[PDB]
Amino acid sequence: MSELEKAVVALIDVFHQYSGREGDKHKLKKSELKELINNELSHFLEEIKEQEVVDKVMETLDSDGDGECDFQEFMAFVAMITTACHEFFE
């Protein structure tokens, strides 16, 4: 398995670790998204310490407006992060 293939597997793996905690087990609710960002994105994103930031991030990622982050919305979140890191250093 190449580095890219590992990256594909990691994306699926992390999303499921967090989404299967509570409620709908194929979607990230706000508390699951927060912990995902806090535990797994600590070198890229500011630790989230406030409800209003949790709320705004979910507002941003939630394209279909159902209150949670599904797998496709997670993939779009990853693309945002990846494009930002890319553009920082390019």
Added chain:
Amino acid sequence: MSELEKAVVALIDVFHQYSGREGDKHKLKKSELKELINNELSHFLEEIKEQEVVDKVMETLDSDGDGECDFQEFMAFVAMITTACHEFFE
């Protein structure tokens, strides 16, 4: 660096390895895309052995219709692959 962070870095790293080979060094031309798929996606995608498959894949990924795969189009390609693997096993 967590597994997700590694995956973010790998995405940027692989795209640049391949895109900087020839011509526009921030885009994948057909030959660079083919080698990327052949070398780095061999467990997920069929080896590409034919010009018409190279052509069709590029046709598919090339949303802005400029003939090449830019970083955003690459990110969409990764999402396709990730969603397909996700749905296979779910």
